[PDB]
UniProtKB/Swiss-Prot annotation, chains A, B:
It comes from Severe acute respiratory syndrome coronavirus 2 (2019-nCoV). It is found in: Host cytoplasm; Host Golgi apparatus; Host nucleus. Cleaves the C-terminus of replicase polyprotein at 11 sites. Recognizes substrates containing the core sequence [ILMVF]-Q-|-[SGACN]. Cleaves and inactivates human TRMT1, preventing tRNA guanine(26)-dimethylation of tRNAs. May cleave human NLRP1 in lung epithelial cells, thereby activating the NLRP1 inflammasome pathway. May cleave human GSDMD, triggering alternative GSDME-mediated epithelial cell death upon activation of the NLRP1 inflammasome, which may enhance the release interleukins 1B, 6, 16 and 18. Also able to bind an ADP-ribose-1''-phosphate (ADRP). Inhibited by pyridone-containing alpha-ketoamides compounds 13a and 13b. In turn, alpha-ketoamide 13b (tert-butyl (1-((S)-1-(((S)-4-(benzylamino)-3,4-dioxo-1-((S)-2-oxopyrrolidin-3-yl)butan-2-yl)amino)-3-cyclopropyl-1-oxopropan-2-yl)-2-oxo-1,2-dihydropyridin-3-yl)carbamate) inhibits SARS-CoV-2 replication in human lung cells. Inhibited ex vivo by michael acceptor inhibitor N3. Inhibited ex vivo by compound 11a and 11b. This is 3C-like proteinase nsp5. The chain holds residues 3264 to 3569 of 4405 of the full protein. Residues 1-306 form the Peptidase C30 domain. It catalyses: TSAVLQ-|-SGFRK-NH2 and SGVTFQ-|-GKFKK the two peptides corresponding to the two self-cleavage sites of the SARS 3C-like proteinase are the two most reactive peptide substrates. The enzyme exhibits a strong preference for substrates containing Gln at P1 position and Leu at P2 position. 3CL-PRO exists as monomer and homodimer. Only the homodimer shows catalytic activity. Interacts with host FBXO22; this interaction promotes the proteasomal degradation of nsp5. Changing residue 145 to A: Complete loss of 3C-like proteinase nsp5 cleavage.
Length: 306, 306
């Protein structure tokens, strides 16, 4: 019993983190086989960031302009290329600790573990969700660029996020490992800002199921709702509409507790319209939306990883 | 920017997790150098657990009655002993992945990361605090015994907790790595219950400083209080008394933000006596007490260079 924000074990990713230096800039890179992936803005000076011509800036660079350090060992760069917003540095050594991996672009609402790194050295791990507005509410200090987010699937480590920048409100923007930003953000100094956000309804329901699994039941009722009527209430409270796909993904938690998804929706409708009346759920006085259905399953069933 | 429940990267501990089997019982062990540490209750049947004579049970077992599996490799047990509530299995191979490490005993209010494991394999990592009543509000299922809690400082893992049991309210109890329980708990099946818990005052204050750092200021006021006057209010609200040592520990955060410790106490006194009136602090409607002052500095400022 118990329910905590729980990250995936980070060891397989820790063994892939390196330090990348170009000119006066140092950040983090991801070393998989004989390639190091990092944000392409490592090649930019402060002046360059105003309107960087990345193709021109990269043409002027050579392999020796890039320093890669894995622990206390220098890896010599023997090639460089650019894929969207990610720099790929071919190095003289394949990472002997490379896990089975894939690059996956996640959807808004889905969570991942972030391994916050500085100077190529992992410093902490925590859970984040990709918000509907395509930002993450991370915790990152100077030097954190290139830190990565990941999940572990049944097959392998699934890298989904590379950290690029902090937005004015203190939330964070980055790319997948193919270098495509989540959301409309760009790796230039512009006026860009996060748009309005929305609460991830399927995750709130998953967390209510986690609460029932853990013995918190006061919010269950005998009321019913249709999916349409629930979604109208959800929209009033700036929750995302719940799709039938989301209902289907909640199936395993519905089965584990014996509470049909639409009955949990009737509970959530009352919570949105009436609040908690001084009660708590899993120790919280607010509804939590950064656990996915699978996050609840992996924690409440004790799934383990390679 | 940002503030998250942040754990230490788990890789250095993952490399030490093994599976220990005695009879029909399997749990987790910690393999450091040529010793595997695990809860001694691994030697008990359910019937033994009612009133176990551990000395007698252990003296009648031989080395070959213990199976230790590290990944797919069987380790050979060449000796065994009991130190308080921890069993120590000497094996004929030193763990090549042994990190720099220490065994430390923590105090209530201090935090650590937990690598929850099942059958010697890692499930997830989370952060928690040792409660004033010496339990931890963990996330643990059957099979998780022998999972460890730890802090990491400059590549050195300080192990502070080994998991032994879940208590009737669903909170968790365990030992230091020398086998001494935290709190009034014993490794036998008996009616034992956690005592009444209290809130970790110094940690709430630290979190309020984290909130100021992250831009929250509404709870700051023009009021003042003495340490003795504040502690009169703290006692009324089931908060631990605040000591001058706690005030000294809060020194750096106080100087960094310009908010005297006793002025933050005045803010906390107002929060306890009046509530939040519909507002939030760091996106929470309740006061958080599982971040220490050092945890706040580590996350918002970083670790100093050695
Ligand atoms: Cl913004
Ligand atoms: Cl061995
Ligand atoms: Na809350
Ligand atoms: Na109890």
């Amino acid at each position: 019993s118990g329910f905590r924000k729980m990250a995936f074990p980070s060891g397989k990713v820790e063994g892939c983190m390196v330090q990348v230096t170009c000119g006066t800039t140092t950040l983090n890179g991801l070393w998989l086989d004989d390639v190091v992936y990092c944000p392409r803005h490592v090649i930019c000076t402060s002046e360059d960031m105003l309107n960087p011509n990345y193709e021109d800036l990269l043409i002027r660079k050579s392999n020796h302009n890039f320093l890669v350090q894995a622990g206390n060992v220098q890896l010599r760069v023997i090639g460089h290329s650019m894929q969207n917003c990610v720099l790929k540095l071919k190095v003289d050594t394949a990472n002997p600790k490379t896990p089975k991996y894939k690059f996956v672009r996640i959807q808004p609402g889905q969570t991942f573990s972030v391994l916050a790194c500085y100077n190529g050295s992992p410093s902490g791990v925590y859970q984040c969700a990709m918000r509907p507005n395509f930002t993450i509410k991370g915790s990152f200090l100077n030097g954190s660029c290139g830190s990565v987010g990941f999940n572990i699937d049944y097959d392998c480590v699934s890298f989904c996020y590379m950290h690029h920048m902090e937005l004015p409100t203190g939330v964070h923007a980055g790319t997948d490992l193919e270098g495509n930003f989540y959301g409309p953000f760009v790796d230039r100094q512009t006026a860009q800002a996060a748009g309005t956000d929305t609460t991830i309804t399927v995750n709130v329901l998953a967390w209510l199921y986690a609460a029932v699994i853990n013995g918190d039941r006061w919010f269950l009722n005998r009321f019913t709702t249709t999916l349409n009527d629930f979604n109208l209430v959800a929209m009033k409270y700036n929750y995302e509409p719940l799709t039938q796909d989301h209902v289907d993904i909640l199936g395993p938690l519905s089965a584990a507790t014996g509470i049909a998804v639409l009955d949990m929706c009737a509970s959530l409708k009352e919570l949105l319209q009436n609040g908690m009346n001084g009660r708590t759920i899993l120790g919280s006085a607010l509804l939590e939306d950064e656990f996915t259905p699978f996050d609840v399953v992996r924690q409440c069933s004790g799934v383990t990883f390679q």
